[PDB]
Amino acid sequence: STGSATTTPIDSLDDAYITPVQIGTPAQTLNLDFDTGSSDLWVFSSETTASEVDGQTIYTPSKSTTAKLLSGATWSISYGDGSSSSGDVYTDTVSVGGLTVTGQAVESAKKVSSSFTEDSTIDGLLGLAFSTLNTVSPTQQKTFFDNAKASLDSPVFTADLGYHAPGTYNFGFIDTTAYTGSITYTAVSTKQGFWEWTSTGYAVGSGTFKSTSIDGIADTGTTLLYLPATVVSAYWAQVSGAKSSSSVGGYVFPCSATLPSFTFGVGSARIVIPGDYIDFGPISTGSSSCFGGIQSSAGIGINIFGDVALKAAFVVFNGATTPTLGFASK
């Protein structure tokens, strides 16, 4: 089998992407944030504290003839941005782009943190990291991809995120029309539960490529590119007036600037992030200070190849017995 679904930016900055997901019988369609940095499929639901729902579409398991409470199971998650959510668990039928999994754990939120409430466009998350990170207790549950893997034509999914435009998540096949050149594959460590890999270096604008190993994760659920302080300083030094602002919480730059591209290495190959992809706009409405899309990871503990990096590529998440990642230009 295969599936294919369009993913759409939630706003004009590409802060996140939503993909429609059919849950239950009859289908309840929710728009979920596919997140290769986490491993829970959780949704706003009829069980969510009413004051914490503000415009999201909810899953109502009592209206699904295929829903079944997973007795005794609870979940609770905290993300790298400080947000969190928790609740109980049902199993139900879940379909993405024509690919159906029966018995998928659907984690129903009883509580969500304020940042989820405040974003009416995201009805939940669909985790695509390794199932070892799933938070369901006392019996850890499998991701949608893990459950679908054996049925897929090939045990892969691909992320093709758009810049200010829709893109595509495919399951079970490589669309060879969706990228240019060849796909360069690189080794993955699953020891931390992430799609963790080592970039071979970077360049700033038209500058010389610096060969240096940068370990990080491919994370569709993180907006920005978080890299070591040395790398980030080298980038922003090429932007007149850019500075790190403790009050704002990162590098800012004059909105009148033209940003240089940023290149990262995948083996001997190179993925070029255009400068415009690094502009995240005014820090507050009407400001002429703009927020940078490349930020230091020094306070995170891991480097993160978020959407800024991934949307410059066609990305293959190869879930073979030994997983690998593939990147192509597009």
From Swiss-Prot:
Disulfide bonds listed in the record: 255-290
Catalysed conversion reaction: Hydrolysis of proteins with specificity similar to that of pepsin A, prefers hydrophobic residues at P1 and P1', but does not cleave 14-Ala-|-Leu-15 in the B chain of insulin or Z-Glu-Tyr. Clots milk
GO biological process terms on file: proteolysis
Broad EC category: hydrolase
Keyword Protein transport: no
Domain Peptidase A1: 17-328
Its EC number(s): 3.4.23.22
Section of the entire sequence shown: 90 to 419 of 419
GO molecular function: aspartic-type endopeptidase activity
Catalytic residues of the enzyme: 35, 199
Annotated family: Belongs to the peptidase A1 family.
Keyword annotations from UniProtKB, A to Z: Aspartyl protease, Disulfide bond, Hydrolase, Protease, Signal, Zymogen
Protein name, UniProt field: Endothiapepsin
Coiled-coil parts of chain: none
